[PDB]
C-alpha cells in the first residue's frame with residue numbers, strides 16, 4: 021500500500037491568509053478554505069500560535085476542525101513567492117459541514133509544486149509540432165500560428181470547417197468566466213455550428229425532456245433530501261459520485277436524524293425516517309450504505325435489466341394514476357390541460373428527430389404511457405410485488421390522507437441510458453403527478469456531474485438536432501479542431517474508431533509540418549492548409565496536462581485552473597460561490613477565458629492583415645486582462661439577477677454563497693432563491709408544465725439490440741469513488757494509481773471461474789465497436805452476465821467498446837454496452853500488492 | 863533541531879499474548895493514539911514474527927477519526943461513519959473509503975524474548991499534526 025511517510029505537517033499560523041475555495045471537482049461543491057503563509061514561517065502548538073486557537077500538543081477528538089491530512093498540505097507559488105498552503109474543508113459550510121471526499125481532500129497535493137515536486141506533468145509553455153517533435157515556444161508565436169491556419173481555413177471553406185470541442189461545465193476546467201470567454205469567441209464573434217461538449221458529441225442538452233416539459237433540472241435544494249418521505253434515486257451511485265450530498269443530507273434522513281426538523285417545518289402531517297428506492301441494475305456501495313443506515317426494510321433496490329427504466333416508470337405512473345394517488349389540485353392549476361394529437365409516426369417515432377416524445381396533458385400521458393405491472397415485470401426483470409411496493413412508496417398518502425413527499429434524483433444511469441428523452445420525461449411524469457416539484461421534501465432533479473457555470477451567447481445557430489461532431493471527424497470532414505478541457509481519447513463513445521481516424525488525419529498534418537520550413541511562416545501555413553485540403557486535420561489543444569488526444573495535436577496551449585485564478589460556479593442546488601485565487605498558474609499558463617480573449621485578439625489582427633476587416637471586427641470585445649473582466653462581461657450582464665453579483669459581494673458571502681437566481685442585494689447580502697417553481701409557474705410560454713406521452717419502444721439507439729444479442733456480457737460502466745474523471749491529475753497521484761494501476765472490471769466470481777480468470781488478470785473486452793483492457797476484480801454482488809468497468813481511464817479506456825449509437829438528439833448511450841471478454845495476461849506483478857476485497861462496509 | 867520525528871521504541875506486547883485473528887488493543891506512539899496488534903496467519907506486508915504475520919495499525923479512521931471495527935470474517939477494518947474499508951493483509955490499503963491515506967501502519971520489531979516493539983508509523987495519525995506530540 022502506498023504510504024507517504026510524512027510524520028508531521030507545518031502548523032497553520034494564526035496570521036495565515038484565508039481564501040474561500042469551492043471544491044475543484046464534483047457537483048456537490050463542498051466548501052473549503054485555503055490558508056497560505058510564508059515559506060520561512062510556521063505556527064506553533066500553543067493556542068495563540070495557530071489558526072485554530074487550540075492546543076495542538078494534544079490528540080484531537082473525532083471530527084475535529086483542528087487537523088488536516090498530508091493530502092491537504094503543499095507548498096505553492098503565490099505572487100512569485102513560495103508559500104505553505106493548506107486546503108481544508110469548511111466546518112461552517114452548510115453543503116458539507118466540514119466533510120471532504122477522497123477527491124476534494126487531495127486538492128493541495130494535486131496542486132502544482134516545484135518545491136515539493138507535485139504535478140510536474142503540468143503544462144508550462146505553448147508547444148508546437150516542428151522539427152520532428154513538440155517544441156516549446158512563446159504565446160505570440162503559438163497564437164499567431166493557430167490564428168493564421170484557423171483564419172485561412174474559415175475564409176476558404178467557411179466557419180463549418182472549424183470544429184470545436186469544449187467544456188460547458190463549472191468548477192475547475194469550466195465556470196462562468198471560462199464558458200463565457202469560449203462562448204463569446206465561437207458564438208458571438210463566430211457562428212460555429214460544428215461544436216461539441218466535453219461529455220457528448222453534439223451541442224445539445226443532456227435533459228431536453230425535462231426542459232421541454234418546463235421543469236429546469238436543478239429545481240430543489242439539498243435540504244429537500246433531508247425532508248422527503250421517500251428518496252427515489254435513479255441511475256446514481258451517490259455515495260461514490262455525489263458523496264457529501266449523500267453523506268451530509270441523505271444519510272440524516274435515512275437515519276431519522278432529520279425527524280425533528282421535519283416535524284418543525286411540516287407539523288401538520290406524519291413523518292418517519294426516510295425510505296429510498298434505488299433504480300440501478302447494479303448493487304453498489306450506495307445500496308449497501310443505505311441498508312446499513314436505514315435497515316433493509318426501508319431500502320428498495322430495483323435491480324432492473326439494463327436500459328429498462330422507461331418501462332418501470334411508465335408502469336409506476338400508470339398504477340399511481342389508476343389509484344388516484346396524484347395531486348389533483350397541482351395537476352389542474354399548474355399543468356397543461358389542452359387536448360393534443362399524437363404525431364403520425366407515434367408510438368415508434370416522434371413528430372421529428374427534434375422531438376422524440378409527445379408533450380401532453382396528464383390524462384393523455386397516462387393513456388399513452390400505459391403499461392401493466394405484469395408487462396413491466398417482464399421487461400425490467402423485476403417482481404410484480406417490487407413494482408407495486410415502489411408505487412406505494414412514491415404515491416400512497418400518509419396517515420390522515422396527506423400527500424407523500426418524494427425527492428426524485430437521477431444521473432447518468434438515466435441520462436446515458438436507454439431512450440434519454442422518453443425516460444427523462446417518464447420520470448418527470450411521476451414528480452408532476454405527485455406534486456413533488458417546488459415544495460419542501462420534493463424535486464425531480466439531476467444529481468449532477470461537475471459543478472455548473474454556463475453563460476454563453478445564443479446557440480440558436482447550432483440547430484436541434486445539432487451536428488454529430490465525432491461522425492464528421494471520423495468521416496473525414498472539418499479542417500481545424502480546437503479542443504478545450506476534454507480528452508475524447510479517454511472519454512468519447514466509439515473511442516477506438518475515433519482514435520484510429522484521428523491519428524491518421526492529424527498525422528497527415530504532422531508529416532507536412534515536419535517537411536516544411538517553420539521560420540518561413542507563410543510556407544508552414546500553406547503546407548498545413550494543403551494537408552487539410554487532402555483530408556488532414558490541424559488540431560489545437562488547450563489543457564493543463566499532456567493529454568491523450570494531445571498526443572495527436574499540433575499546438576498545445578497551457579491553461580491555468582481553479583485556484584490559480586478566481587472562478588465562479590454553482591452546485592446542484594444552484595449555490596453560487598467564488599473560489600478566490602490562492603496561487604499562481606504554472607509557468608506561462610493562462611486562464612481559459614484569457615486564452616480565448618488572446619486568440620480573439622490574434623484573429624482580429626490576422627484577419628485585418630489578410631484584408632478582411634469586416635470579419636476581423638467581429639472579434640472585438642475581448643480586452644480582458646483578468647478573469648474578473650470575463651465575469652463582468654458574461655455573468656454580470658447576461659445571467660438572471662446578474663446585476664446583483666460581483667466578486668466583492670460573493671467573497672463576503674463566503675463558502676455558503678447564495679442560491680441562484682439572485683433577486684436582490686440588501687445589507688451586504690445577495691438574496692437568492694431556495695427552490696424553483698414554488699408558485700407553480702413553469703418555464704414554458706403559458707407557465708404550465710407538460711406531461712410526456714412516452715411509450716416504451718425497446719432499446720432505441722441503433723445497433724444496441726443486436727450488440728446485446730450477439731455478445732456475452734453487459735459492460736456497464738461509470739465511476740469509482742477514488743478516481744476523478746479521466747485521471748488527468750490522478751495519474752500523477754500515487755495514492756490513486758497504487759490502488760488501481762489498471763481500470764477494474766467488476767465481475768461475478770462464478771463468471772470469472774467460467775471464463776478461467778483470477779483476480780488481477782488483465783482481460784480484453786471486445787465487440788463490434790472495438791477492444792480495450794481491464795483488470796478483473798471479483799465482485800460477489802455482481803449479477804451473473806453483468807460486469808462494470810471503470811470509465812475514462814488511461815490504462816484501459818472503456819469507451820473503446822461503446823458503439824456510435826445515440827438517441828435522436830445525439831445523446832450518447834454509453835450505459836447500454838455488451839461485449840466479450842478474454843484473457844490477455846495472467847495477473848501482472850504490478851497488481852500483486854492490491855486488495856481485491858469487497859468494497860462494501862461490513 | 864532534528865530534521866525528522868523522533869519515534870520512541872515502545873514495547874507493546876509479547877508474541878505469546880496474541881491469538882490468531884483477534885486484535886489486541888495497544889497505543890502508539892503514546893497512550894492517546896489507539897491501535898491494535900493483529901496476527902493474521904499468513905505472511906503480509908509489514909508483518910513480523912516467525913510467520914511474518916503480525917501487524918500493527920492505528921485504528922482511528924484517517925478521514926474523520928471514528929474508531930474502526932474489525933471484521934474477523936473478511937479480515938478488514940470498517941468505519942461505521944462513512945463506510946470506509948481497510949485491508950490489514952495489504953498494508954492497510956483502503957479497499958473503499960473517504961480517507962486520502964491508507965491505514966497508518968507500525969514499524970514493528972520482535973526481540974529475542976518475543977517482545978514486540980513499535981518504532982515508527984508510515985502515515986500521519988488522525989488528529990495530530992505530528993505523530994510524536
Ligand SMILES: Nc1nc2c(c(=O)[nH]1)N[C@H]1C(S)=C(S)[C@@H](COP(=O)(O)OP(=O)(O)OC[C@H]3O[C@@H](n4cnc5c(=O)[nH]c(N)nc54)[C@H](O)[C@@H]3O)O[C@H]1N2
Nearest residue numbers: 193218219505506507511562563564579581745746748834
Ligand atoms: N463510457 C462512458 N464514457 C463517458 C461517461 C460514462 O458514463 N461512460 N461519462 C461522460 C461524462 S458524464 C463526462 S463528464 C465525460 C468526461 O470526459 P472529459 O471531459 O473528456 O474528461 P475529463 O477527465 O473531465 O477531462 C478534463 C480535461 O480538462 C483538463 N483540464 C482540467 N482543468 C482544466 C482547466 O482549468 N482548463 C483546461 N483548458 N483544461 C483543464 C484535464 O487535464 C483533462 O484533459 O466522459 C463521458 N464519457
Ligand SMILES: Nc1nc2c(c(=O)[nH]1)N[C@H]1C(S)=C(S)[C@@H](COP(=O)(O)OP(=O)(O)OC[C@H]3O[C@@H](n4cnc5c(=O)[nH]c(N)nc54)[C@H](O)[C@@H]3O)O[C@H]1N2
Nearest residue numbers: 255256257261302327431432433469738739741744745835
Ligand atoms: N468519484 C467521482 N465522482 C464523480 C465523478 C468522478 O469522476 N469521480 N464524476 C462526476 C460526473 S462528471 C458525473 S456525470 C457524475 C456521475 O454520477 P453517476 O451517474 O452517479 O455515476 P455513474 O458511475 O456514471 O453511473 C451511476 C450508476 O448508473 C448505473 N446504471 C447503468 N446502466 C443503467 C441503466 O440502464 N439504468 C439505471 N437506472 N442505472 C444504470 C450504474 O450501475 C451506476 O451505478 O458523477 C460525478 N462525480
Ligand code: F3S
Nearest residue numbers: 043046049050121124
Ligand atoms: S469534496 Fe469535492 S469531489 Fe464532490 S463530494 Fe465534495 S465537491
Ligand code: FES
Nearest residue numbers: 923925926941944
Ligand atoms: S470517519 Fe471513517 S469513513 Fe469518514
Ligand SMILES: [Mo+4]
Nearest residue numbers: 219468469470
Ligand atoms: Mo459528467
Ligand SMILES: [O]
Nearest residue numbers: 219468469470
Ligand atoms: O457531466
